Design a protein around this motif. Structure first.
Motif, short mmCIF file in Angstrom:
data_model
loop_
_atom_site.label_atom_id
_atom_site.label_comp_id
_atom_site.label_asym_id
_atom_site.label_seq_id
_atom_site.Cartn_x
_atom_site.Cartn_y
_atom_site.Cartn_z
N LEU C 199 -8.08 -23.12 -8.07
CA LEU C 199 -8.55 -24.02 -7.03
C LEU C 199 -7.49 -24.27 -5.96
O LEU C 199 -7.84 -24.65 -4.84
CB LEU C 199 -8.99 -25.35 -7.66
CG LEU C 199 -10.50 -25.51 -7.86
CD1 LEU C 199 -11.07 -24.36 -8.68
CD2 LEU C 199 -10.82 -26.85 -8.50
N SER C 200 -6.22 -24.05 -6.28
CA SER C 200 -5.14 -24.19 -5.32
C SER C 200 -4.15 -23.04 -5.48
O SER C 200 -3.83 -22.64 -6.60
CB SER C 200 -4.41 -25.53 -5.49
OG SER C 200 -5.30 -26.62 -5.34
N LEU C 258 -5.29 -32.71 -9.83
CA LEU C 258 -4.80 -31.41 -9.37
C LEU C 258 -3.38 -31.52 -8.83
O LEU C 258 -2.52 -30.69 -9.15
CB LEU C 258 -5.75 -30.84 -8.31
CG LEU C 258 -5.47 -29.45 -7.72
CD1 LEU C 258 -6.77 -28.75 -7.40
CD2 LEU C 258 -4.61 -29.56 -6.46
N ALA C 259 -3.12 -32.54 -8.01
CA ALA C 259 -1.79 -32.70 -7.42
C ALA C 259 -0.74 -32.94 -8.49
O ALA C 259 0.34 -32.34 -8.45
CB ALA C 259 -1.81 -33.85 -6.41
N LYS C 276 -12.35 -22.85 -11.82
CA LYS C 276 -13.69 -23.42 -11.78
C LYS C 276 -14.58 -22.79 -12.85
O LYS C 276 -14.27 -21.74 -13.42
CB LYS C 276 -14.31 -23.21 -10.39
CG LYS C 276 -15.41 -24.19 -10.04
CD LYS C 276 -16.43 -23.55 -9.10
CE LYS C 276 -17.44 -24.57 -8.60
NZ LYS C 276 -18.00 -25.38 -9.72
N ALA C 277 -15.70 -23.45 -13.13
CA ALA C 277 -16.72 -22.90 -14.01
C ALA C 277 -17.74 -22.14 -13.17
O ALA C 277 -18.33 -22.72 -12.25
CB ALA C 277 -17.41 -24.01 -14.79
N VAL C 323 -5.34 -13.65 -16.78
CA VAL C 323 -4.92 -13.36 -15.41
C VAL C 323 -5.88 -14.07 -14.47
O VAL C 323 -7.08 -13.78 -14.47
CB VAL C 323 -4.89 -11.85 -15.13
CG1 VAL C 323 -4.66 -11.59 -13.65
CG2 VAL C 323 -3.83 -11.17 -15.97
N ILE C 324 -5.36 -15.01 -13.68
CA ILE C 324 -6.16 -15.80 -12.75
C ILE C 324 -5.83 -15.35 -11.33
O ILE C 324 -4.71 -15.57 -10.86
CB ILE C 324 -5.91 -17.30 -12.92
CG1 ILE C 324 -6.33 -17.77 -14.31
CG2 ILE C 324 -6.66 -18.09 -11.85
CD1 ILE C 324 -5.88 -19.17 -14.64
N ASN C 325 -6.80 -14.75 -10.65
CA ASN C 325 -6.65 -14.35 -9.27
C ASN C 325 -7.22 -15.44 -8.36
O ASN C 325 -7.57 -16.53 -8.81
CB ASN C 325 -7.33 -13.00 -9.03
CG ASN C 325 -6.96 -11.97 -10.08
OD1 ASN C 325 -5.91 -12.06 -10.71
ND2 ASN C 325 -7.83 -10.99 -10.28
N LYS C 326 -7.30 -15.15 -7.06
CA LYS C 326 -7.82 -16.13 -6.12
C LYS C 326 -9.33 -16.32 -6.27
O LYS C 326 -9.83 -17.44 -6.07
CB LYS C 326 -7.47 -15.73 -4.68
CG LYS C 326 -8.05 -14.40 -4.24
CD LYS C 326 -8.05 -14.27 -2.72
CE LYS C 326 -8.82 -13.04 -2.27
NZ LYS C 326 -10.24 -13.08 -2.70
#
Lengths: 524, 524, 524, 113
Positions: C199-200, C258-259, C276-277, C323-326
């Motif tokens: 998300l960020s 999140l911050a 996100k889901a 692995v988390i991409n954009k």
């Protein structure tokens, strides 16, 4: 040569600037309370004058386009002055007002052509209203009164013009000459006048009046277009050894003959003036024959056979005095046998009585009238030479004013005729909104001259203008006495011809300048 | 000297700037509601004119490249005017439209040669459509109607033109002259007119019309090219001492002879005009012999034995009036024996009878027609000299317009013939896409003049153009009355030759300018 | 604050200058024989690259208008790169060609909207032609070929990707990460991949690869959205006392949670991600339950009565590598009993055979295929670190190219496909002529990239382009070998997706820039 | 009838309006031309001729107008080019208000650069 070209708005703005400069230069000399303008001279002493004609004469700007506009206005004002005898300043200020308001309307986005149409319609209606408002000046009393008014309220000049016109006729010719004794002298001598002027201004003997005068000159009578100098060289030499002035009237004078005549006039060895013959064709030949009989000479004609080389002094026409202007030429007291004059007039009358067509009858009638009426010469007299010059100038100015009056009557002077006509025409309408705005522009411009006069007087322009508008007839404001009344009865008269011509020429130049879109002029 | 060279886009941009300046200067004077352009004069009084010819003549730019572009457009417009008698403004605006659209296409990357091909194809199709749309002007009723239309709806000029073309023929020579009396006079006199003009433009007697006119001139006939002046020095001396002018025609005049003729003309001592002999070879000799018989003179032939020093005043041919123009020269009423003319026409017609080849028969028929038809002289008479001159100018303009009409018919004037033709050519296609772009450019350019006229009228250009395109035939928009309908009935007539020549010359100059890639001109 | 505005032609020429600078900077690297572009860094050592992506990222203009044009073409090129996986240089040069030709046409006067319509029509026809010309890539030999040529002709990667596709199908999930040893080994693990990223961008652990990589992550599966920290801090303290990384999987993460998680990640107390889901409604909850079964954990849902407060380590999901991409993330080796996966696939199975609506039917097919397919991981080994990391980059690029080829196919590389499509689309026309002009513009623009490649190769491009146009099929010009032939046979090829996306985005940006009339930017 | 043709229809209907003073008539003509303007701008964006389309729509009556999207005339309601009467009325009234405020503006006060 390269040219600078302006399109639309810029050219109109430049003309507005030039017209504004010229009009502000000339309008301060309007009205009895008008200011005066100082004009430079190379001699050193500046010339101070309240005459708008001179002020216009020495206006010319550095910017080419502004100079073009100023010269257009100057030319139309000069045409008005020549046609009428006065109204240069009035025509110039009217033209400035129309041009300014019309350029404002054009910049507003309206069609210039419809604006010019409306201006012309309003000015035509104004001319009709001026004709309605004019009062006749046919009887002797009104003639004398107008002559007195024109000559700075001097009764002697007015009455003298009155009996001169009564002796010669309202349509007759009157000339002014210097008198010998103190008393003024009036006499009628045989002569005639025609509208043929000089070829070039270089023949002008006296620049102050812009005319040519010759004392006891010799008149040349040729039926051919003067082109070669060697033909009349013996005649020129004979006249020069005689020492008297020389005048030529023929079909046309062009080329080396005109060039050498101008050269001789500049050198002054022989004083010769070049004037074309009146009319054209057989009528021109008839008028030349009439002039020959009047002067006692013989017409040098190709069909006869004898040429300019064979001409002699005794065959050459002679007169006591001739006056030449760009608009007319006058022959005064031509030395000729009276028996020949009566024979010629009798044969003209029998030609009239045998004439059939209306045009030929009218032409012969005017020819016989001008041949038999003669010239009524006015010899103005005074104690002092300078005061006699001043009196002669006043007499000639009154003569022009009275001629205009007897031609078209007189109206309420001082610029109130225009405001009265605008008040009458305030209900005028056109076929389009642009035409209506043009009519309103013309009416406001007609209002303008009285406003300028009263502004020169120092009073309030709008208040006086509306006060005069509220009145009717010849009621108006007097600039000198600063109090209203009947303008005719108070001694402020302007001929209807002068005002009508000024308004018409201002309208024409304003329409031409409003419809102008492009220019061509030399680069600085 | 050093030269400034522009390549590609920069040269075309400068050319477009110059053409735009000239076309904007001359385009505001198009249509009845056309504006007027003020031209500066060194005398001081500017000239306000609605004539596009004078505006184009006065245009010259400071920048060399733009000046040359404007000069090319001016030259093609002048060529169109000389060929047709009108259409200078129309040709210039058509050229400007084609030029702007073509330069836009060239900047887009279009092929200039293909664009020129498309323009030429579209213009040829337009000429064909104009020929299809034209109506004949053969009957005298249509001739009189066109003549009346040309001179501001004056029936007098129409009937004079109609009767002149009935007396002498549609292919005859008609010349105007000043009328001695009030009534107009038409007479037929012997004479001939050939296509050769003056050698140099300075011989023009009257710069207003750009033509040379002589009263009772002598006619000189030489079978050899004139280069030396010593050969005819006694001849010119005898002519000068005689007084009457002399017109010399020979194979050619150049070098010191032409130089000294120009010197004599500018000094004014001797007025002599030089024109090349018509034709070449045997035809030239035959035409010279015919002119010798017509004027009563003798041909100075070296091989026969006569030589210029041996020529006397008796040998010189004589006429009462001749007219010389850069396009043609007219000989009017030469004093010659009628029996001599009868003998010449008899020998020419028997030559035709014994002639075999078609070309020689046609040339001899042209010779006999131009020798026996004579010249129909129109004497424009009026009541005043100035109105006589104005009527003479109007009659000459009407004569030129009617000559163009009888040559090629009349189309619907006011610029609606071009828009009608462009509407008819909507399906025209070329062999290339660039050619199609050029064809569309030509169509829009032919649309342009009507748009310019109605923009001068102040109305919306696009709406009027679409309304006119909606109709068919001669239906169009009247500029003066601001209302649609048939243009032929309202009298808005333009000769088909005028429109055709304007369109063709505009297309030619636009193609030459589109296919232009480089210049050479002097440095500032 | 205050902004400067440009209108019409000036805006277009500024945008054209900016795009021209961008394209001249980026297109010199196009083709196998691409030039070198040197870039500054403030560190001290300039970098030299032959790829257009880095040059496009590093390029921008000082003047705002050219700058923003450069960035809009840059962003469309970046979109093309993100979608297809390559083609930034081809898309940028295509955009430059279309923009230049279309702006020239607009300056010519054609309507920009019709130009855009024609360009879009031509580009759609080109996409159809490319689809027709595409060679399917389904055989394992084709997979080896695309993997080989896509990886600088390295065949080992070709076979590796070949057995990757063999093990997990064409549409499966394939990943490559750092490995030990010398040999390259392949293994399949239970996993999946859904289209949700971080998300960020501040959650990233490996900014170099742009992926949030976690070793043995410990994930959270909350159906409810997470806003604050009170209910979710027990998870943080549990993972802190357990020393395991945390990942977060929720419907939506917002608020200051999140911050603060980003802050704790920065301080290094514990690594926490946020993804996100996928989907929305009940489908997201169902697939989150599927994820929980795959990872052996329990989903935190407010619908089932439980809350996030009591979430502990024993009853929460865990994974071995993620692995988390954009945009999407891959779960690798979800730890858990296989019986859970068997039960879940069975339940989804009856969801298929009692599914009513079709859309849900395909949705359940993709869900069951994604869950039961697993994730294939390939391990790359070598001698030292540098060459195995280079092999990592080569393998990643080859995998992306293979995915694109499987998705849409393979066409001839080096711009041969574009020139062939342009040749095949020679007869396309639109409703208006401006549409045809736009079609021609698009055809020449898609011609351009091969010309640029040939120009980089050192040969003049016109002859090569016409020679390739003369051929048919996949025949084309090989820049590397400087010879022609079947472009597939030499092996130089690119996926159809890359060319199609480049053409689409170039056309989109070119139309957007052609239709631009006004530009708004801050003052300098 | 949307697409800027309601204003041109209203101006065509009101072309016969008059005021107390000639300046009021000039203002009325100004307002009518301004009402004409938006359709001219729309069809200029479309690339067609502004004046011809404006005159063609003026010739028609009711909701007949020029469809910018399809470049063909007819009843604007049927093709679905609908603008709320409130929207057009408010736009016209607010434009009139701001233009009347600005035309009578005679002086300004601003901070120096």
């Amino acid at each position: 040569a390269a040219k600078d070209v302006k399109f639309g708005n810029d050219a109109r703005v430049k003309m507005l600037r030039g017209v504004n400069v010229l009009a502000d230069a000339v309008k301060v000399t309007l009205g009895p309370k008008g200011r005066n303008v100082v004009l430079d001279k190379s001699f050193g002493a500046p010339t101070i004058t309240k005459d708008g004609v001179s002020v216009a004469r020495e206006i010319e700007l550095e910017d080419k386009f502004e100079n073009m506009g100023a010269q257009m206005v100057k030319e139309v004002a000069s045409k008005a002055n020549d046609a009428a005898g006065d109204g240069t300043t009035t025509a110039t200020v009217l033209a400035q007002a129309i041009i300014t308001e019309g350029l404002k309307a054009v910049a507003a986005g309206m069609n210039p052509m419809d604006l010019k149409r409306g201006i012309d319609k309003a000015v035509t209606a104004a001319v009709e209203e001026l004709k309605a408002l004019s009062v006749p000046c046919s009887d002797s009393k009104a003639i004398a009164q107008v002559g007195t008014i024109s000559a700075n309220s001097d009764e002697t000049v007015g009455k003298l013009i009155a009996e001169a016109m009564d002796k010669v006729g309202k349509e007759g010719v009157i000339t002014v000459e210097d008198g010998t004794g103190l008393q003024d002298e009036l006499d009628v001598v045989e002569g005639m006048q025609f509208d043929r002027g000089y070829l070039s201004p270089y023949f002008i003997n006296k620049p102050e009046t812009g005319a040519v005068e010759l004392e006891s000159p010799f008149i040349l009578l040729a039926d051919k277009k003067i082109s070669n100098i060697r033909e009349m060289l013996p005649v020129l030499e004979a006249v020069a050894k005689a020492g008297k002035p020389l005048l030529i009237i023929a079909e046309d004078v062009e080329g080396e003959a005109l060039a050498t005549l101008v050269v001789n006039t500049m050198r002054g060895i022989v004083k010769v003036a070049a004037v074309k013959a009146p009319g054209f064709g057989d009528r021109r030949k008839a008028m030349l024959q009439d002039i020959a009989t009047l002067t006692g000479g013989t017409v040098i004609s190709e069909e006869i056979g004898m040429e300019l080389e064979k001409a002699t002094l005794e065959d050459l026409g002679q007169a006591k005095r001739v006056v030449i202007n760009k608009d007319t030429t006058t022959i005064i007291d031509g030395v000729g046998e009276e028996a020949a004059i009566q024979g010629r007039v009798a044969q003209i009358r029998q030609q009239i009585e045998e004439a059939t067509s209306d045009y030929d009858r009218e032409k012969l009638q005017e020819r016989v009238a001008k041949l038999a009426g003669g010239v009524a010469v006015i010899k103005v007299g005074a104690a002092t030479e300078v005061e006699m010059k001043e009196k002669k100038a006043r007499v000639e100015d009154a003569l022009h004013a009275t001629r205009a009056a007897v031609e078209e009557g007189v109206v309420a002077g001082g610029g109130v005729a225009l405001i009265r006509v605008a008040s009458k025409l305030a209900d005028l309408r056109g076929q389009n909104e642009d035409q209506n705005v043009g009519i309103k522009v013309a009416l406001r411009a007609m209002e303008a001259p009285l406003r300028q006069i009263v502004l020169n007087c120092g009073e309030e322009p709008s208040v006086v203008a509306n006060t005069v508008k509220g009145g009717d007839g010849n009621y108006g404001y007097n600039a000198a006495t600063e109090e209203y009344g009947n303008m005719i009865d108070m001694g402020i008269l302007d001929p209807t011809k002068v005002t009508r011509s000024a308004l018409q020429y201002a309208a024409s130049v304003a329409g031409l300048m409003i419809t102008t879109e492009c220019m061509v002029t030399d680069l600085p």
